[PDB]
């Protein structure tokens, strides 16, 4: 129950439960498959 | 969810453990690519590492102090700590600062808690009960000059009145001018040859003025204000390397000269355990 | 008027509680969000990116050189480097992994340790990396080392080797601050055959080493880092 | 017979071929794109010179020697004088751009050495003076020359200490930023595609640089016996999807 | 009795909170409303009405004359007036727009600047008005001025010209109190050809200038105005 | 939920969301179209 | 050159209207190809037809 009118006044947000490290761990242009050779 | 699957002997032409790090990727290698594993489940979600959780607890962001005393003959209230302002910041006490600067841009609502306690360092008959007034003074508003100016009327400016010993709590929406607050800014306010570098309005969060509403009693009373800040509804972009050297200034990246080696030297060889 | 009773804890301020508050700026409209590449949601997302380990810690002031593990041509049987696995201390401590682990009290999971070789292309080498699970001493010679988790690495076209320290543990969580009961083992590396340089070439070659966490990893019970402190408030 | 290894990038009227690549990085897995209306604020129609600005400019070459500490360029600064890109830059009030960065360094199978090529969004530098000394404008706008981390401290300039990234963080952790290594034994180029990253939809191109490109030797250069002890490093950069807005009189900037 | 816990902030008085209160006058019946022309609902409704700008600020005591921009017959190429666009200060500051902007911290949007000509009907003139977006200096000659937003105004039967300063900005909000990073440009005006008076006529002619906000406009984060203060409470 | 009986005791009103500047910006008797000549 | 050598050259075409370039900076602003000497021994640069008039004289 929100007792207040504005959105800033609500409690903390709830877990992204998004999670996708590939923008950080695999930003390569041509896709690399694990097990296939790195450099062909 | 499985944390590890079962995997047995391998004799392949398909080697997942040989890679080329020059590419910039961190290939997702697992225990089961190089030893024989058994199934195990995660039993865990990663709840407490969510950025909302990481930045979402109150941190002390500021300690100031004002006193209640006879202003009779004081030529400069501000200077007597008859009242005091604070331009809001999150980079003056380092604990929360290192946490925020793990990101480049950050967006969140703030919840402030203000604790005020009184001290009577010299002979008093009693402890008086003082009411503090905290005024939010956005840039362009008249700033208080005396501890009882017309400014304190605060007819258009949000202000909270609470008692010393108690706590005040309110929450302010994300007041940034851009889409996020810049944790860093490699720019100037204009192409001036001598303008300041790095410090920017892009970060500006307002400013706050404190005073005691009470007139003076016979003794003097020191009131020390602690402002706590909790981020709620957090959004963070672009992770960066953590801060290694100590901080020297609000808003610049500068570290102190003749600082000490930050990497612990081995007591022994490279070969040592 | 509805009858109430207040409980113990009334009026307390717990920095970790999460409740509603009045907005000081009623009706204010925040700036629209625009799109920015790079959003982070979990610290678990970022500790999977690998970063360099200053393994060569033996210097006396921080230098680019403590990131370089040297290799000697023609040595046989000998040991390249050694370290315990207290990820919250020692070599690990300044790495991004080490640096984040320090915001939490407990960790569990597998680690990924990789070595990228930088010697001339016409050289060759075979190294063995060994993980020694808790309970034995840091190995003292390859024979000892080779009886635990190990990978023979053959230096080739493929420049990096990724070793995983699989989670070997009785207790399901360990402390990030070094603790005995909770200790994780040792990591050592030895010549399997030996580094060989081509003609017209000389000196030391170096390995770069990285550390990142497997998707396996769990961190819990947040706390304050020993990695940052201060004596007076900063000002502008 | 496609290898990760050979590549061709054609952009405008200019083409680059590498026969010894190591894939390419696209920052944060996003490719440069123009500014959508839903994200727009300034009401001005923007100008998109296209092929006259989105081509490859090769900056002047550097020389890697055994004593090198590393070099640093800022964008869009490094290009402030390249052809029509630069003119547009000084003539509009606001502009926006992504880039393709191609760093080149070839040697032989007897050399060793490894450079880190990294892009840092919002790289705010530190003053070597400490305290709250600022870093003057000119110092953070080196132009095509870039900053040479093995040059001496100057007054009003930034600190040039490599183990600290010019800001109080450790060299070892720069790997959290989009980056690629050039390891003579593997690699001979590094290519990074940079999408536009800012907290505003479009900004000023002269008062704010939005990325620093940094090339840092990490495993020292080691040449074969009686070889000359140095290699040149060349940086070629191409603006991509550039848009300029708020045209007028032509900015005058310090120094 | 229902168990409760009170949170931090209990008992505080926040001048901006909005809650229910007991009525001191239970059951009282207010006077009926009758109809009155002119109801205002938003301050955004009124800042779109244009008001005069004391552009000719050069006097020494407030006078009707600082609303008049003078024009000289037969000058060529020259400059009629110049001003920066800090709507919260300087010429703008006493105008209704300026006066309202000052109740808020941030503004964004387009401005409408118009000039009404008052010279004899048998005279003629062509002026150029130029808006210079942030980043360049106030133009120093028409050549410089004409390369930015401009309108050639031809003085005719239609007495006023409405120039719009379209919102040109990186950041989506600017500060109303003058700030650099956040600055908006300059506005200048020059003879395009020149004012020409008919025979039997002489002297200076004047332009009146107005300012109002386009429907585009946004103002946010209310605060107190520097435009009014006091030293003791007033009495009757 | 109002806890009190009288209307004066309720909280602040809610946004007009009315907005019509024409009584102030265009109170002319004969309608002016933008683009058509002001004085015919 | 020997197979164990390496080189990177830039070829530049300068369309009519400017002088023969005097340094690479000047050269690199017109039609150009960075050539990386590798396994593939030849590089084919095209001088695309850049012209107002649709025919030129051979003399």
From Swiss-Prot, chains A, F:
Quaternary structure, from the entry: Interacts with capsid protein VP1 and capsid protein VP3.
Residues of the full protein shown: 30 to 69 of 2179
Disulfide bonds: none
Post-translational modification: Myristoylation is required during RNA encapsidation and formation of the mature virus particle.
Subcellular location: Virion
Protein name: Capsid protein VP4
Lineage: Viruses, Riboviria, Orthornavirae, Pisuviricota, Pisoniviricetes
Domain of life of the organism encoding this protein: Viruses
Functional description taken from the UniProt entry: Lies on the inner surface of the capsid shell. After binding to the host receptor, the capsid undergoes conformational changes. Capsid protein VP4 is released, Capsid protein VP1 N-terminus is externalized, and together, they shape a pore in the host membrane through which the viral genome is translocated into the host cell cytoplasm.
């Amino acid at each position: 129950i929100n007792y207040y009118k504005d959105a800033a006044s609500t409690s903390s947000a709830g877990q992204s439960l998004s999670m996708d490290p590939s923008k950080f761990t695999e930003p390569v242009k041509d896709l690399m498959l694990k097990g296939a050779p790195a450099l062909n | 969810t499985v944390a590890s699957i079962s995997s047995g002997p391998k004799h392949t032409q398909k080697v997942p453990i040989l890679t080329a790090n020059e590419t910039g990727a961190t290939m997702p290698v697992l225990p089961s690519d190089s030893i024989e594993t058994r199934t195990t489940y995660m039993h865990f979600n990663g709840s407490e590492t969510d950025v909302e959780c990481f930045l979402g607890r109150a941190a002390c962001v500021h300690v100031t102090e004002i006193q209640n005393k006879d202003a009779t003959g004081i030529d400069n209230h501000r200077e007597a700590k008859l009242f005091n302002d604070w331009k809001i910041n999150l980079s003056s006490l380092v604990q929360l600062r290192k946490k925020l600067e793990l990101f480049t841009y950050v967006r969140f609502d703030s919840e402030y808690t203000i604790l005020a306690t009184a001290s009577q360092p010299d002979s008093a008959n009693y402890s008086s009960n003082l009411v503090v007034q905290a005024m939010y003074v956005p840039p362009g508003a008249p700033n208080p000059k005396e501890w009882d100016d017309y400014t304190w009327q605060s007819a258009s400016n949000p202000s909270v009145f609470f008692k010393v010993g108690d706590t005040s709590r309110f929450s302010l929406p994300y007041v940034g001018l851009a889409s996020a607050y810049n944790c860093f800014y490699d720019g100037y306010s204009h192409d001036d040859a001598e303008t300041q570098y790095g410090i920017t309005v892009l970060n500006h969060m307002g400013s706050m003025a404190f005073r005691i509403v009470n007139e003076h009693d016979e003794h003097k009373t020191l009131v020390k204000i602690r402002v706590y800040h909790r981020a709620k509804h957090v959004e963070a972009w672009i992770p960066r390397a953590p801060r290694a050297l100590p901080y020297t200034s609000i808003g610049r990246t500068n570290y102190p000269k003749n600082t000490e080696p930050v990497i612990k030297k081995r007591k022994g060889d490279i070969k040592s355990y | 008027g509805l009858p109430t009773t207040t409980l113990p804890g009334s009026g307390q301020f717990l920095t970790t509680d999460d409740r509603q508050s009045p907005s000081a700026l009623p009706n204010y409209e925040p700036t629209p969000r625009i799109h920015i590449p790079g959003k982070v949601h979990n610290l678990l997302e970022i500790i999977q990116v690998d970063t360099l380990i200053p393994m060569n810690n033996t210097h006396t002031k921080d230098e680019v050189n403590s990131y370089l593990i040297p290799l000697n041509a023609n040595r046989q049987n000998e040991q390249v480097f050694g370290t315990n696995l207290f990820i919250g201390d020692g070599v690990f401590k300044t790495t991004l992994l080490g640096e984040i682990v320090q915001y939490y009290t407990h960790w569990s999971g597998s680690l990924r340790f990789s070595l990228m070789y930088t010697g001339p292309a016409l050289s060759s080498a075979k190294l063995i990396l060994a993980y020694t699970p808790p309970g034995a001493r840091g190995p003292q010679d390859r024979r000892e080392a080779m009886l635990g988790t190990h990978v023979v690495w053959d230096i080739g076209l493929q420049s990096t080797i990724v070793m995983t320290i699989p989670w070997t543990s009785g207790v399901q969580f360990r402390y990030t601050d070094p603790d005995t009961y909770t200790s994780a083992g040792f990591l050592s590396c030895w010549y399997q055959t030996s580094l060989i340089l081509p003609p017209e070439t000389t000196g030391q070659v170096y390995l770069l080493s990285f550390i990142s966490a497997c998707p396996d990893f769990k961190l819990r019970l947040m706390k304050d880092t020993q990695t940052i402190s201060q004596t007076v408030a900063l000002t502008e | 017979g496609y290898s990760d290894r050979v590549q061709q990038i054609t952009l405008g009227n200019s083409t680059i071929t590498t026969q010894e690549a190591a894939n390419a990085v696209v920052c944060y897995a996003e490719w440069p794109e123009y500014l959508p209306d839903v994200d727009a604020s300034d009401v001005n129609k923007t100008s998109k010179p296209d092929t006259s600005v989105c081509r490859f400019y090769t900056l002047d070459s550097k020389t890697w020697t055994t004593g090198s500490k590393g070099w640093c360029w800022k964008l869009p600064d490094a290009l402030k004088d390249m052809g029509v890109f630069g003119q547009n830059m000084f003539f509009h009030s606001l502009g926006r751009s992504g880039y393709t960065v191609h760093v080149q360094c070839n040697a032989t199978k007897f050399h060793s050495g490894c450079l880190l090529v990294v892009v840092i969004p919002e790289h705010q530098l530190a003053s070597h003076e400490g305290g709250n000394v600022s870093v003057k404008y000119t110092f953070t706008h080196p132009g095509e020359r870039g900053i040479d981390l093995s040059s001496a401290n100057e007054v009003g300039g930034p600190v040039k200490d490599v183990l600290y990234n010019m800001n109080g963080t450790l060299l070892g952790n720069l790997l959290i930023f989009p980056h690629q290594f050039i390891n003579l034994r593997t690699n001979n180029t590094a290519t990074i595609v940079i999408p536009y990253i800012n907290s505003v939809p479009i900004d000023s191109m002269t008062r704010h640089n939005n990325v620093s490109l940094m090339v840092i030797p990490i495993a020292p250069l080691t040449v074969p016996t009686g070889a000359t002890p140095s290699l040149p490093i060349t940086v070629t950069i191409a603006p991509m999807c550039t848009e300029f807005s708020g045209i007028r009189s032509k900015s005058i900037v310090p120094q």
